[PDB]
Design a protein around this ligand. Structure first.
Ligand code: HEM
Ligand SMILES: CC[C@H]1OC(=O)[C@H](C)[C@@H](O[C@@H]2O[C@H](C)C[C@H](N(C)C)[C@H]2O)[C@@H](C)C[C@@H](C)C(=O)/C=C/[C@H]1C
Length: 396
């Protein structure tokens, strides 16, 4: 294949990518394509292959195995679990797994609940009963929850959305590259602000751990860590809520069910993950040796992107794919990945989302999408699945 150019494929490829992915799936598992941003990457589509690869060791996420160059501003924060393999990935993750167990996170419900609640109160405050569920709840919830955890003074949180934006499609490649340096700068400063202040938040914990013994957690790794624990639960958990809602609000029949019975909540918040999950394609993976993806051979060092979005629509795994059913069997979706890199914060995310949906359906009479689905606009970025905004309204 000449190599499918995603860029020149319409701002609707950001809208409904699926047909393009499926079309590829039909011809084979792997495909070379140029991303809307440029660079050459491989796309692995089709559920069975997707799941498979995610856990395949031959696909290392350690940039040392990539033949793609890394700018200095990037090289800075590339010492985290999601960008390394054993033994390093093993070593690092261990450092903070106890902080994200369903049991531990559950302890945060009281707080998370209160955080959502405060946010909803302010929403219903509007006189016309119209607000953007994005800047109104979906965005502020994640960034707060996590920021109290990692210990980010609140005034400091604004610059974060700013950067994340640049990271995702920014209106200029050199601008996002600035956001990274800027962030590294902040985090590094912040890391130090903690030293000797006997704080008990996660970050303070790590700063102590790292000092006590640098062989267990290097200074770069310390940086990388704080960075990854932050920017990995953003775009994802923030769009989870948005996508989730946009999904439930554009399928009245389903909104109805959940309204009638709220026990379907957990299972509905799951189908959201399957149907319109936040991550379109898993993060970068590089073959340590050439991999023969059935007929198609991928060179060592090339960038492989497992397309979570497509596997979720592969009809041989998920019948009536494009159908948003909250009573569906969502068992086995790749929303949070598969393998050793399986989301470390799946519990924290789920909690937030579950409390978030819960709130809305409840505290919002005649809640509804405030614009037509065709009017919404998604982010061109091929690695994410987010709405520019999500208008709504409710019985004034
Ligand atoms: C809707 C929410 C979330 C989604 C969709 C999501 C999705 C994922 C996915 C797909 C991976 C694996 C990526 C890959 O292998 O390419 C992953 C990894 C990870 N996630 Fe999440 N995530 C979410 C929320 C969270 C939260 C709330 C945190 C932070 C507290 C978090 C922290 C991480 C980290 C640091 C990893 C590294 C895993 C490892 O390498 O062992 N995630 N997540
Ligand atoms: C967990 C899935 C999302 O990706 C991420 O959370 C990671 C942290 C991040 O990718 C990293 O971004 C850094 C700024 C640079 C780093 N590079 C030095 C190696 C890179 O690996 C994303 C948050 C980037 C943004 C743009 C995004 O939208 C991610 C979506 C998920 C893949």
């Amino acid at each position: 294949p000449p190599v499918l150019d995603l860029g020149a494929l319409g701002q609707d490829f950001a809208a409904d990518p699926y047909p393009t992915y499926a079309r590829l799936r039909a011809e084979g598992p792997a495909h070379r394509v140029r991303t809307p941003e440029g660079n050459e990457v491989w796309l692995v589509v089709g559920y069975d292959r997707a799941r498979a690869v995610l856990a395949d060791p031959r696909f290392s996420k350690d940039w040392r195995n990539s033949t793609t160059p890394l700018t200095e501003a990037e090289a800075a924060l590339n010492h985290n679990m999601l960008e390394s393999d054993p033994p390093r990935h093993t070593r690092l993750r261990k450092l903070v797994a106890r902080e994200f167990t369903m049991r531990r996170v559950e302890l945060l419900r009281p707080r998370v609940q209160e955080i959502v609640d405060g946010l909803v109160d302010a929403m219903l405050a509007a006189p016309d009963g119209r607000a953007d569920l994005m800047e109104s709840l979906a965005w502020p919830l994640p960034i707060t929850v996590i920021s109290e955890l990692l210990g980010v003074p609140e005034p400091d949180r604004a610059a974060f959305r700013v950067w994340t934006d640049a990271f995702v499609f920014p209106d200029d490649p050199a601008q996002a590259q600035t956001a990274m340096a800027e962030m590294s700068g902040y985090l590094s400063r912040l890391i130090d602000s903690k030293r000797g202040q006997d704080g008990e938040d996660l970050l303070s914990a790590l700063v102590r751990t790292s000092d006590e013994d640098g062989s267990r957690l290097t200074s770069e790794e310390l940086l990388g860590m704080a960075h990854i624990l932050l920017v990995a639960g953003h775009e994802t958990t923030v769009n989870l809520i948005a996508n989730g809602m946009y999904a439930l609000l554009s399928h009245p029949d389903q909104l109805a069910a959940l309204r009638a019975d709220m026990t379907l909540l957990d299972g509905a918040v799951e189908e959201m993950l399957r149907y319109e999950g936040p991550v379109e394609s898993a993060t970068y993976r590089f073959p340590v040796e050439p991999v023969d993806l059935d007929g198609t051979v991928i060179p060592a060092g090339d960038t492989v992107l497992v397309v979570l979005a497509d596997a979720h629509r592969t009809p041989e795994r998920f019948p009536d794919p494009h159908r948003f059913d909250i009573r569906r069997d969502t068992a086995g979706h790749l929303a949070f990945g598969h393998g050793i890199h399986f989301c470390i914060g799946a519990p924290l995310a789920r909690l937030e989302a579950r409390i978030a949906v819960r709130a809305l359906l409840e505290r919002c009479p005649d809640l509804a999408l405030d614009v037509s689905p065709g009017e919404l606009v998604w982010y061109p970025n091929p690695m994410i699945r987010g709405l520019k905004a999500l208008p709504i309204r409710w019985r004034r």
